[PDB]
Amino acid sequence: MVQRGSKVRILRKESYWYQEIGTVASIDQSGIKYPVIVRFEKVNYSNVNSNNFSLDEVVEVE
Amino acid sequence: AHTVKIYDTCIGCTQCVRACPTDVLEMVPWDGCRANQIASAPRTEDCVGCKRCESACPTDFLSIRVYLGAETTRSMGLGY
Amino acid sequence: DVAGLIPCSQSDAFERRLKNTTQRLENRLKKYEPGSAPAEALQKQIDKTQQRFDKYRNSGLLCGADGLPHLITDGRWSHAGEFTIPGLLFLYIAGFIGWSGRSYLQAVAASDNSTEKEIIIDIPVALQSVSKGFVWPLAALQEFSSGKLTARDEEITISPR
Amino acid sequence: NLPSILVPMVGIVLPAIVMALLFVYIETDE
Amino acid sequence: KIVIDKDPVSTSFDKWAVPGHFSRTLAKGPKTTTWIWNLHADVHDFDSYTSDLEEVSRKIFSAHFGHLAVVFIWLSGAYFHGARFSNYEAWLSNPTTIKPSAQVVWPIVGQEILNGDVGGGFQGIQITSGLFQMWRASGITTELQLYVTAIGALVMAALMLFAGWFHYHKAAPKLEWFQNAESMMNHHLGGLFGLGSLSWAGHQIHVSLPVNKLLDSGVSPQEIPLPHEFILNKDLIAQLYPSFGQGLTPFFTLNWNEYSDFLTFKGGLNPVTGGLWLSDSAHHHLAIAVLFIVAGHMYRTNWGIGHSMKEMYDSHKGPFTGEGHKGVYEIFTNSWHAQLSLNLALFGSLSIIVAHHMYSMPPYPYLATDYATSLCLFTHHVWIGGFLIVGAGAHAAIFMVRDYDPAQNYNNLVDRVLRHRDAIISHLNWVCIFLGFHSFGLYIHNDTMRALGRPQDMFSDAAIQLQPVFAQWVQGVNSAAAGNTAPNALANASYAFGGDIVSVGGKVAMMPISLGTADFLVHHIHAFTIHVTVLILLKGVLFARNSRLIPDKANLGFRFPCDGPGRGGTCQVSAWDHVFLGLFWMYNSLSVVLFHFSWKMQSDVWGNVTADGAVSHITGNNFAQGAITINGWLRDFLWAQASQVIQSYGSALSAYGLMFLGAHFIWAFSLMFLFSGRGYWQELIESIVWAHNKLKFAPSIQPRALSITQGRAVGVAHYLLGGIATTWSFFHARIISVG
Amino acid sequence: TLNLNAPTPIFGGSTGGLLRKAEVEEFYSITWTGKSETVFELPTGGAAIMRAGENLLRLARKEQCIALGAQLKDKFKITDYKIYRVYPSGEVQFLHPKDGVFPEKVNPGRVAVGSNKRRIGQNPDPAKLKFKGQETFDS
Amino acid sequence: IGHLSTPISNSSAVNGLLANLPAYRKGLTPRLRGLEIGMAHGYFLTGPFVELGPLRNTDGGILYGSLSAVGLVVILTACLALYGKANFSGSSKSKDATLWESGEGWSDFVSGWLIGGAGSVGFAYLLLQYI
Amino acid sequence: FSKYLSTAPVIGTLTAFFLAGLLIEINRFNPDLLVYP
Ligand code: CLA
Ligand code: CLA
Ligand code: CLA
Ligand SMILES: CC1=C(C/C=C(\C)CCC[C@H](C)CCC[C@H](C)CCCC(C)C)C(=O)c2ccccc2C1=O
Ligand code: SF4
Ligand code: SF4
């Protein structure tokens, strides 16, 4: 279980920020798949900084 | 025709639909939640393959993909 | 004498390059007025030539059949000043500029706006990294031993497999 | 003498034949 | 009506800190490294971020002051280096023998070998800019007059730079001060062009003509009185052309015939120098002034009399063309790009007209015998002119994307050209293919005929003749025109059409450039290469908004790389990419014009004259039978005349040899950007960010590959720089040695 | 339906439109009501004038209809554009709005065509689908 | 309206020349209109071959030049046969039903181009070497 | 203006102006340094 503000590492192998550190901005309090919103320092090639991940793709390195 | 497949990491952002220049895409309600949406491509025969729907998807490594298949007269974008 | 290369003090092809370089400048001098300003600039050019042939004769260089000084990199210590000595002189200077820009970026990245400080360069943090950059052959030794010079592969981003 | 017959045969005539069967084989249809 | 604003912009350094301050897209910080190139791309494009035409035009006005500053700064350096570091004083005593020179090179690592034996008691770089011949025609005899002019340009540079600060920060004019085109046309015609040619006509009479009358009598540059003495001492201006003793009473009483000795119509070349007669050019700009001052009283202002350009276009409409020119005035007083493209078209079209009128009618004394300068003066202004014509097709395309309004343009002359553009482009498409076959294929025919041992079947002068009869006739009506249809002129408009050989020194100043079978071929190569260059640029203009392929190409922009790999692939569809492709074709077109020029003159025109009168040219009349085949263009021109740019190592021409190979590098380096694409490098950089992220020092400004539009731009920039600077080095090292 | 005949805009021009492809198979027509007599750019060349109308325009491509149908929604705010594709020498009537509403708006009763119940990193290798009729993205 | 209306578009001075050429003329059968087309093009095609040839000042040049021009017509008979083999497959009908739209006569048109093409090449050989 | 001189193009130029002029003045008093003597 990840909470907001927690510094996570992404295990989604397709992501631009795979195996990189980001801070969770929020989690969605419903049963929606991919609820974990992580904000990253580094922008991807579409110059965005957020994505929706699941709890299986993140860890709790804090 | 080019194949357009929409993956489940979509968020109902509606951005790829309004960036389509040939009116391929549309928004549809979702089954398991009945509140959020997803894009859908019921008119893939109209698809020219411009990949403007991939330039508008906000998810990291976009939820809608375009695979350039066989080239008909519509997908070649020919006025003749 | 390592590859049939005679030294340049007894190499006659090298001593004949000097005879033709000054003869191509004395005939360039022979037409001008002797007290003029282009006349003295050719004698400054003639004597600058004589200061490179006498600099290469006494340095013990190796001239071939053409008469040009060849360099020998296998590094021998009798020919150490060709590549080994300015190469060591190179490697400290390049590693100084290398470790300075690396120490600058690690200091800047743990701040509020890191990308801002790459455009406008913080002269405090820039001159700090010069102070941390002069000690780099010592500073990288305890940096590599501490485990914080490199990163493990679970921390870097990597293309999908 | 055989060069004078053979080189305008495969230089001109024989390409014009194989261009004809190919162009019919391309633009035919089932 | 002058209307301004008082202090709209403060004079602060708060925005000097932040780069990218002007736009909402920038100044947030570079998250990637494209921002470093996004900043330098859209700075001087004021129209994008600022959405007020009043604010846009104030930026544009005060910026030309800054460009006026850098020209004056550059002009002072032309005058300073002629004052200090030149042999201009020794050159006036012997202008044929002594090579013109400035730019002494410092005694460092060996580049003081470039300070060569250039003439007299001076050592420097033999320059090819013609400033020595321009200052002699201006009358300058000592270096003090060059030194004060270098100071005079720097105070003028500060005057323009202060005026750009003043007219944006302090007193910026409103929009209505800029939209007054009739008062602007009135002022620039009579004032800038008329008084500028009236006041220069004053210099050529009082200053240039007296000192040149004694210089072509050949006394000394020291014995000649200073040019203020020709204003003060009226007895001194009476011993040479004694019509100054009557004053301005021939002028006001219309008895202008008394000025028949310093306002002539002699019209030839000076037999002592090989330049135009200065009394012709004195009479010239005086006649140009009155035509320009009178024409500046044409357009209407706040005094009622005068033409209105809005009502000349209304009721200039035919039955073919619908509503006529109705709307082109309102387009031209609102679009800054349509004003830019048209003023760029005829600035670059003029710059090639300047090149053609200056080798054949050499305006300056000892410019014609200076083959080292007359070729570089031609090849410069041709090259300057072709860049500006590409900027015409560029800025006409930027007009179409955001300044074109369909509501203002219904059935006018912009609408009706955008409605039959498929008829314009395809008929332009055919005429390139017709000209490419029937001009280049006549070289391919002549290669194949001379290779097969069939020299009687090619197109030559001893073969199937293609004589240029429409140009040889025009050579006849202009060579026999002095005395019959221009009866007051003593000699022809030029010696290029027909006339004697003017021989100044031992060398040809000018001689009749004949036309033959080879000249038919190259002039149709020129007709072909221009028509493709038009075809790429005009396709970009007419299809800048839409096509059958992309119907919303103006919604995507003037400068975007592609609409994707669909519709078969839509790479280089935008209006910017046609400007990018036309740059090579402009490079392709102009480089043949300069290859045509450099060998036409060396074989048929330029050369030496013996003591009897026979001419021996430079390359020896080998343009007639060599320049009809591509092998003769390779063997007798590019291989045979680059024998001075490669045998130049170890001599004073060595920096031409180093610029030769060094520009082959930058040309070939450009193909790395042109042939390849971006997404290779963006995954190659992903291996180099890793090897920097491994040692924990990867930059926070994330490294990106150059964009698709930038990678095209950085590849065309090094392409032109690589080939022009090769042609720069080949031309300079050749004609300095032989001419 | 297409309501042909409907008045063409007052145009008279455009080499660049509706050539021989239209008479054999598949041309398109966009129909709208323009609430002025104002000028608008065509995808062919630029002007016509929109009628009071019932305005109709026969275009060559569907891509040219949505480009014009975007201009009427942008510049004139007339979003009532209703494109078609013709009969016997054409294919399919009533192309847009396909379900009585714009595709960016949600409408129940639509079915998610081309949806995938997986991500893109969960796509199989092509070696697993080698020598089969399956493709590496279809489900 | 989709087509542009210039003042010289639909002019009767050139719409009468189009309606009377043997490609649009109403009274002709495909054997006759192939002959009229073939007689015109074969007549001028021997023009450039006899005056611009590899051999022009020979015995010799009028025959071999005209031998080259019938060489083009026998090539272009194949092109008119191959265009009819390809574009009229099954004699593909269309909306107009002319010689150019559906096939319907096409084997006679190529022979008509063959007869008139080889005729006027040889007919102009008479007026050049003789007459 | 001092915060302007800390920006990348100017401080990329004046240090390159410094490092070039370092190398330029070296070759004037110490010409033709092939090897270490
Ligand atoms: C590779 C094979 C090939 C061969 C063997 C030839 C042979 C020839 N060509 Mg070349 N040509 C070729 C390919 C070839 N061509 C290609 C690929 C090009 C494009 C680069 C050319 C471009 C070219 C030009 C522009 C010309 C030639 C000409 C010639 C003729 C020069 C000698 C001559 O005049 O005899 C004298 C003989 C004659 C003048 C008449 C020959 C008999 C004619 C061609 C056929 C008679 C018709 C016959 C009933 C049926 C058709 C048979 C035919 C298709 C073989 C010779 C027949 C010249 C020529 O005369 O063209 C006809 C000429 O002007 N060629
Ligand atoms: C000297 C005092 C001074 C000061 C403090 C300012 C300050 C300002 N000016 Mg002003 N202005 C001035 C004089 C001054 N200006 C002059 C002399 C001119 C006439 C050129 C102008 C014309 C002008 C315009 C049109 C605009 C400004 C603007 C500005 C504001 C932002 C500019 C900026 O931050 O970029 C600083 C820019 C630089 C440091 C680059 C200067 C480039 C110079 C002029 C030419 C360099 C080319 C050179 C020849 C190099 C060639 C290549 C090389 C390799 C050889 C800032 C308040 C902008 C504004 O107010 O936006 C709302 C704006 O649009 N100024
Ligand atoms: C030298 C290399 C080269 C060549 C040959 C061409 C040729 C052409 N370019 Mg290209 N182009 C080039 C470099 C070249 N370009 C480069 C580097 C760029 C990137 C900037 C471009 C970008 C470009 C643009 C943007 C455009 C062109 C266009 C054209 C065409 C102009 C039409 C014409 O006159 O054809 C005449 C044909 C020739 C001159 C070729 C000579 C061949 C001889 C005469 C005939 C061949 C002999 C024989 C019959 C061969 C057949 C026998 C065989 C089959 C057995 C022509 C095909 C334009 C176009 O297509 O518009 C119509 C156009 O708009 N090109
Ligand atoms: C080589 C190449 C690249 C890679 C080139 C890049 C990334 C440019 C980077 C090179 C410059 C020189 C980096 C400059 C870095 C610093 C500014 C250096 C500062 C040094 C100071 C001392 C001045 C592309 O991105 C590309 C894209 C599209 C088509 C072709 C190509 C292409 O050919
Ligand atoms: S484009 Fe992709 S991310 Fe955006 S709404 Fe459509 S499916 Fe979701
Ligand atoms: S490729 Fe283009 S046309 Fe096809 S769905 Fe995506 S945006 Fe629409």
Residue numbers in the entry:
A (entry chain E): 1 to 62
B (entry chain C): 2 to 81
C (entry chain F): 26 to 186
D (entry chain I): 4 to 33
E (entry chain A): 14 to 752
F (entry chain D): 78 to 216
G (entry chain L): 15 to 145
H (entry chain J): 3 to 39
How do the authors describe this structure?
Cyanophora paradoxa (hereafter referred to as Cyanophora) is a glaucophyte alga that is thought to be an ancient eukaryotic alga evolved from prokaryotes, because it has a characteristic chloroplast termed cyanelle. We present a 3.8-Å resolution cryo-electron microscopic structure of tetrameric PSI isolated from the glaucophyte alga Cyanophora paradoxa, which reveals differences with PSI from other organisms in subunit composition and organization. The structure of a PSI-monomer unit within the tetramer is similar to that in the cyanobacterial and plant PSI cores, except that the cyanobacterial PSI contains an additional subunit PsaX that is lacking in the Cyanophora PSI, whereas the higher plant PSI has additional PsaG and PsaH subunits but without PsaM.
The final cryo-EM density maps of wild-type PSI monomer1 and monomer2 were obtained with a C1 symmetry at resolutions of 3.3 Å and 3.2 Å, respectively. Monomer1 contains well-known eight membrane-spanning subunits (PsaA, PsaB, PsaF, PsaI, PsaJ, PsaK, PsaL, and PsaM) and three stromal subunits (PsaC, PsaD, and PsaE). Monomer1 has 84 Chls a, 19 β-carotenes, 3 [4Fe-4S] clusters, two phylloquinones, and three lipid molecules, whereas monomer2 possesses 81 Chls a, 19 β-carotenes, 3 [4Fe-4S] clusters, 2 phylloquinones, and 3 lipid molecules. The locations of these molecules are similar to those in the prokaryotic and eukaryotic PSI structures, although the number of Chls differs significantly. There are two copies of the psaA and psaB genes in Cyanophora, namely, psaA1/psaA2 and psaB1/psaB2; however, all of the PsaA and PsaB subunits in the tetramer structure is identified as the gene products of psaA1 and psaB1. Examination of the subunits in the tetramer exhibits that PsaK is present in monomer1 and monomer1′ but absent in both monomer2 and monomer2′. In particular, PsaK from one monomer is tightly associated with PsaL from the adjacent monomer at the center of the tetramer. Gln88 and Ser89 of monomer1-PsaK interact with Val64, Glu65, Arg70, and Asn71 of monomer2-PsaL at distances of 2.8–3.2 Å at the center of the tetramer. Monomer1-PsaK is also associated with monomer2-PsaL through hydrophobic interactions between Ala109/Pro113 of monomer1-PsaK and Ala27/Val28 of monomer2-PsaL at the stromal side of the center. Residues in this region are required for the interaction of PsaK with PsaL and PsaK from other monomers in the Cyanophora PSI tetramer.
